[PDB]
Amino acid sequence: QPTNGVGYQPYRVVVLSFELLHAPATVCGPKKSTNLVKNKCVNFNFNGLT
């Protein structure tokens, strides 16, 4: 009923379960990729592996 007290009103619930396995990725954040700089000492990130 819409007249229920707040703890007895309906709530929509979503659980975003994440898994990254010993495997490729298929979902990613909005971040820009860039060119591959070989042979120099570089900071890097591949698919979130910093």
Binding site: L21, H22, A23, P24
Partner: peptide
């Protein structure tokens, strides 16, 4: 009927490259 499997049915357990190593 039945048969002996011997050593058979081994597979790559994860998509990780490993070489010149023994892994458990």
């Amino acid at each position: 009927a039945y048969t002996n499997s011997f050593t058979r049915g081994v597979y790559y357990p994860d998509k990780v490259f490993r070489s010149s190593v023994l892994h458990s």
